[PDB]
Amino acid sequence: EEEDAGLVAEAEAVAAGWMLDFLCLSLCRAFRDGRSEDFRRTRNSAEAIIHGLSSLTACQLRTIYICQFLTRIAAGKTLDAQFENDERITPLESALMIWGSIEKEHDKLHEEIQNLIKIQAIAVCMENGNFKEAEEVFERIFGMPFKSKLLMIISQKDTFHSFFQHFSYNHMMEKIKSYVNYVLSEKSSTFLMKAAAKVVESKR
Amino acid sequence: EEEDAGLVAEAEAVAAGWMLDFLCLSLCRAFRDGRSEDFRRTRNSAEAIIHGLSSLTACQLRTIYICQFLTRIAAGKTLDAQFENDERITPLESALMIWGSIEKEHDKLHEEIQNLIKIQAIAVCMENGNFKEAEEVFERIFGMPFKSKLLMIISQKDTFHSFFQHFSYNHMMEKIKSYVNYVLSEKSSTFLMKAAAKVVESKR
Ligand SMILES: c1ccc(-c2noc(C3CCC3)n2)nc1
Ligand SMILES: c1ccc(-c2noc(C3CCC3)n2)nc1
Ligand SMILES: [Ca+2]
Ligand SMILES: [Ca+2]
Prior knowledge:
Radius of gyration of chain A: 20 Å
Number of helices of chain A: 10
CATH superfamily of chain A: Telomere repeat-binding factor, dimerisation domain
Number of domains of chain A: 1
Shape of chain A: elongated
Helix content of chain A: over 70%
Bound molecules: 5-cyclobutyl-3-pyridin-2-yl-1,2,4-oxadiazole, calcium ion
Number of strands of chain A: 0
CATH class of chain A: Mainly Alpha
Oligomer: homodimer
Largest sheet of chain A: none
């Protein structure tokens, strides 16, 4: 009975790990395809499964961080979202903190995604008329040539500036989608997806 | 691309079905062991996975109904819970409606669980001093000899009546646990649990 309950709890922990890996892969794919409602529903499922887990491997922690980063990016234009206990941190600033904390290579793509997040963290404030908040975001990020151009835009209140059209929200999203594409290749071999794919393939 | 996206969606639907079956089995077990917090957390996970599904087999629908019934039983003493759009229906009345709707055998255990739910649906109202609400519950359920005894208890306001001690909340719970024990034997062979058990067994 004591050994049996321990065996069941261990099996439930192995099953939860598989469900987490599956849901994290499904979330990345929904983000890549632009399936917004599927992303929202799958994020709810991932969060509930996490609250039912007590141990995470380093790989599962990295995976969770990537999903958290994608969640903040999707809500980048939702300034009413409070992702941190400090209520002044905007969603794109929260995504920037996680992007600089994930144990991943700092290749050219990493740095471009970082700089696109920094420019947009200011742009989304200006696009709503929150000019003082844009200055506060700027001071918290910067904490150049790139630095002084952005401060000049904030002071001039030039919301629809051509600089924000070159390094746009669409460009930031596309570069983040390219990264998600590499992640999706790595996780497409997780236990749950592989066994589900074999069942579908066997009925064709 | 069009065929590939269809294959992925089918595989995700097969994986979700496995996760639902696993979570429903885990919920029944937590209910049986009296692990209240695990029941609460696993119910949240089951609900989120259901909102991500669009097709359910008859077996999966029956399983969902059993979990819904267990959720109402656990909140039987929480009169502030509103499980139906009709705000007057108490949690035990909601459990009674589902128990009479599940496609299952109406054996001796089924009927005893039904009658224990009916007696307790009144008892939990009286135990809180809600004597008028107990009369309304009584009229919605009854809708005897059993019938006239209960009405006499409601009118006399005898909350701590010996009748409610013979057919008690503990007795209703134990009989429901015996039923859950039969369900647990049937579902202990689901795909996710079987493959998780084999991984744990292979490391001993
Ligand atoms: C997508 C990915 C992850 C989450 C999440 N919620 O809480 C947590 C815990 C912080 C340590 C794990 N992760 N929510 C959505
Ligand atoms: C445990 C079991 C099931 C549920 C649940 N929530 O919504 C539903 C839908 C009604 C048709 C399926 N089921 N919640 C907890
Ligand atoms: Ca705000
Ligand atoms: Ca009430």
